[PDB]
């Protein structure tokens, strides 16, 4: 995709600084993360348009047995059947949502 700007890297980095965004909304802290594009990678400001998210809330599926002590633990980018973006959201919240919460998180300005 595109190269992020300067503004794009810090608003990235502090992001990258959170613990998993959806963990937190269920009370969990999940601080080995990655960083989640929410509007692809190459449109204007899409790179403060990221989450960040544990390999579980990413892209792994979790085994059925974990899942069943944690429900919302699907990936956003499906494994197989289990997760994608839509049963991400009814588990979790939005990603624009999630969004807000990592903002709010890490002190930027929205
Ligand atoms: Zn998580
Ligand atoms: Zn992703």
């Known amino acids: 995709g595109r190269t992020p700007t300067a503004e794009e890297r810090r608003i990235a980095?502090?992001?990258?600084?959170?613990?998993?965004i959806a963990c937190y909304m269920h009370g969990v802290?999940?601080?080995?993360?990655?960083?989640?594009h929410i509007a692809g990678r190459t449109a204007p400001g899409?790179?403060?348009?990221?989450?960040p998210?544990?390999?579980?809330?990413?892209?792994?599926?979790?085994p059925?047995?974990?899942?069943?002590?944690?429900?919302?633990?699907?990936?956003?980018?499906?494994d197989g059947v289990v997760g994608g973006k839509k049963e991400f959201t009814l588990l979790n919240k939005s990603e624009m949502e999630l969004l807000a919460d990592a903002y709010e998180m890490a002190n930027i300005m929205h």
């Open 13 to 20: 980095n502090a992001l990258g600084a959170l613990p998993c």
């Open 29 to 36: 802290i999940s601080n080995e993360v990655s960083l989640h």
């Open 46 to 51: 899409c790179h403060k348009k990221q989450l």
């Open 53 to 62: 998210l544990c390999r579980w809330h990413h892209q792994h599926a979790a």
């Open 64 to 78: 059925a047995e974990v899942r069943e002590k944690y429900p919302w633990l699907v990936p956003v980018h499906a």
